[PDB]
Paper text:
HILDH belongs to the short-chain dehydrogenase/reductase (SDR) superfamily. HILDH reduces the racemic AMKP to (2S,3R,4S)-4-HIL and the other seven stereoisomers of 4-HIL in an NADH-dependent manner, suggesting that HILDH has nearly no stereoselectivity with AMKP. HILDH forms a tetrameric structure, and each subunit consists of seven α-helices, seven β-strands and three 310-helices.
The crystal structure of the HILDH-NADH complex has been determined at 2.20 Å resolution. The subunit structure is divided into two subdomains: the main body and the substrate binding unit. The main body of α/β-folding patterns adopts the Rossmann fold, which is conserved in SDRs. The central β-sheet consists of seven parallel β-strands (β1‒β7) sandwiched between two sets of three parallel α-helices (α1, α2 and α7 on one side and α3, α4 and α6 on the opposite side). The α5 helix and three 310-helices are located on the C-terminal side of the Rossmann fold structure to form the substrate binding unit. Additionally, the electron density map of the nicotinamide ring of NADH is observed clearly in each subunit. No significant structural differences were found between the structures of HILDH-NADH and HILDH-NADH-succinate, with RMSDs of 0.2-0.3 Å for α-carbons.
Residue numbers in the entry:
A (entry chain B), B (entry chain C), C (entry chain D): 4 to 41, 49 to 186, 196 to 246
D (entry chain A): 4 to 246
Write the structure that this text describes.
């Protein structure tokens, strides 16, 4: 049975992955700082902004001889703040969760894949804000741009070991007047849903994605096509 | 049953779509200038650089009530000529097949979908050369960049009518020493195959792609990630 | 003195180059289909959609020994028509002017540069519609994406002969309530002007641009930054 | 005279900016963690202020701004040229080192940019920021996870802050250099094989020099760049055009 590690598991996209992949017979390691909305399911309570906590997670996984075959980096925070009111710590904290955690989680799984000869695969959940900016999101935009780059780099780094690394860039996804604004910035007059991102994860981890690495799949209703 | 029109049907990616989609119970209209390598299948021998033959084909299909639900623009040519020896006609012809035909085919199917309120979708087969240039490929590069732009523009044009328009950008696909230079430009030490593109076409016309429009799906073994 | 050939010379960006570079002691060959808004200036009346007229233009220049050192492809047309009303001839005409003429003109000056060992340079005037789509502009969008791709390819092609090829992508330039929609789509509350493009041209054809080829310079008041 | 604050002033691109802008009569604020190559200049009466600072330390950046405010120095222009670049397999890239690259290459540009913009918005001044990214902000390479991530990030940051401050006439742009011969890349130029590999990945058979970047900075901060914001100007000899 494939083991899949999923960050941000308590909410939104990450949460919608849990039920779905458990139902397809995956063993699931769920990571999140909350667990209130959470079968071979291991739940870990972890603040992914703390690199020491990640490192203790991995010591505990190596002691239980448990290593995932697949990593989904779906934890994310989004500041909602004018840039002049964005503190040094809030900027860093967004970068810690949105970029540093995926880096560290990825380096750790990849180390274990390379040593065992496993053909792992990683899916990074970025955003349309990884390709286009928006007001009041200096840290979110920067971090999501970074994660797209990281995805491309790690694909190159680990490709000769058959480890695939790709990203998904969601547009407006409905989760945990405005609507008019959303519609006039999209081509389609519909909302994305979590399951639209889950199906793309499913495709990107499948055998049918064997030649796919370093790619960013945009799932945005047309947001990024233009103005 | 759904009708899917597929250009470049006689060879490579378009040919691999024919049988695959026949086996999934699609009715198929196959377009190609050759037919030597070609069940509800209609085969049309057509030179897609001739816009008047395209116009006639649509008149015929309207009289037979055989207007497609899905269009796959997979016909393509690539020059292999230094730019100083690339004649006006060679440049025009590559543009006529790789961009003008997809434009006309798309406008025609979309005309019919807006009249009849059908939720059709287009998949355009672009190339990594639509993102990164190469030597001796001025027309191929220009037309593939153009086709990515066209995909964006038509996604926006028709989104309110729930017609989705997407592109796939293949890397080196094995179709009808150099092997080492390919591995050198890729992250993965494997060859893309027609089926890697067919599975992506299949995902992009499926219900699970309902929120996907204007997007370009790169399927290239890491080619475009970097150097 | 350096000779600079400028297309689209009767209007907007190309016209603004004429006086400016004449005043800087360039010899100028001006190309346009009209001449009413038109010293070592050579004016040529020419329909750049007509490929044989371009061939005749070069036949004339070779007799006069007037081969340019610098080419600025500023001729352009943009359709204003919904895509379903965009005819085959009109799509092809936009393509022939916006892409094919830059290609032919570029290949012919590059041929002369390579024979004479001259360090030529080309500047292609693309558009923000070369990066992002908009409604009712299928041809304009496709053609300007194409031109960005052509610029990248010809830079690679001719790099070893020290021929530089770059592009400029203007946003809203004032040339020959809507004013508020333009402000909502830009970061700056000002209008672009032809001189903004002309100064970039002047930098791109200077000795200070020795290491600049294949690049696309965006001059758009923030239009392409996001939404 | 204009005041221009330049990070990475001790070496490379930043040093060449210090020299170039001093020669054109700007008042220069030079920021760098090292100062050996600025000592001679500090002994003259050139209008050069040198601050020794570790830009990876956010509290030290805050102390910089306390010092600038006490000395009445508000720059008109910020050049974020300080940057670092690891050369290491990703599996050997430690948490602290990934973060140090991010801190210098991203966080510091963000903090310095927010602070200058804050003072420009209060005083109604038309400021200008130029961020030095990299071709690695567009195309990845092996053994550069932090560098590639950071440079991608800085391009994004550039676009975001352009949009944020555009109504206040604060322009924010980036430059993405390819291979520029400076102290950071001087390794490469004695190695004949690596020179071939660089030439093979470029369209032009030359190298960039620090002045190719200084000239672009001069353009982007001029009146002739009044309509340019959020943009990224690639200066790479054709590196990024393709393969
Ligand atoms: C976009 O799409 C992706 C999914 O987000 P969504 O739309 O599902 O929104 P969401 O807010 O519903 O999901 C984000 C999840 O990430 C988790 N998270 C945030 N900070 C964390 C931390 N420090 N440690 C562990 N977990 C943390 C949250 O608790 C939450 O459960 C994200 O990557 C986002 O940026
Ligand atoms: C890439 O991927 C896609 C498919 O490539 P492939 O690997 O299958 O290549 P391929 O060369 O094996 O297939 C290309 C097909 O396009 C067809 N085609 C070329 N000119 C045509 C015309 N004028 N009218 C009708 N059909 C024409 C060819 O005959 C051929 O069957 C293309 O868009 C290509 O550029
Ligand atoms: N030389 C190149 O080929 C090249 C290529 C792409 C991008 N770049 C970018 O250009 C910028 C400058 O590069 P360079 O070639 O001049 O490098 P350099 O190393 O010669 O100069 C960088 C300067 O930044 C300073 N710096 C580094 N960390 C710092 C810290 N914590 N606090 C204060 N100062 C610090 C250094 O001490 C140094 O003086 C960097 O952002 C680099 O990433 C350079």
């Amino acid at each position: 049975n494939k083991i899949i590690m999923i960050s941000g598991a308590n909410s939104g996209i990450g949460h919608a992955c849990i039920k779905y992949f458990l139902e397809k017979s995956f063993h699931v390691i769920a990571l999140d700082i909350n667990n209130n909305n959470l079968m071979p399911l291991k739940v870990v309570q972890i603040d992914l902004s703390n690199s020491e906590a990640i490192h203790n997670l991995f010591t505990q996984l190596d002691l239980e001889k448990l290593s995932p075959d697949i990593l989904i980096n779906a934890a994310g925070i989004r500041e909602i703040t004018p840039v002049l009111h964005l503190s040094d710590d809030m900027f860093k904290k967004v970068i810690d969760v949105n970029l540093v955690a995926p880096f560290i989680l990825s380096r750790e799984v990849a180390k274990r894949w390379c040593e065992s000869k496993i053909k792992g695969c990683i899916v990074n959940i970025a955003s349309v804000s990884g390709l286009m900016a928006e007001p009041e999101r200096a840290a979110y935009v920067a971090s999501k741009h970074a994660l797209i780059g990281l995805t491309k780099q790690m694909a190159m780094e680990f490709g000769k070991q058959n480890i695939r690394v790709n990203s998904i860039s969601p547009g407006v996804i409905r989760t945990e007047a405005l609507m008019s604004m959303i519609k006039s910035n999209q081509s389609l007059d519909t909302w994305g849903l979590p399951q639209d991102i889950v199906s793309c994860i499913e495709y990107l981890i499948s055998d049918q994605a064997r030649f796919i690495t370093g790619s960013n799949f945009v799932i945005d209703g047309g947001w990024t096509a233009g103005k």
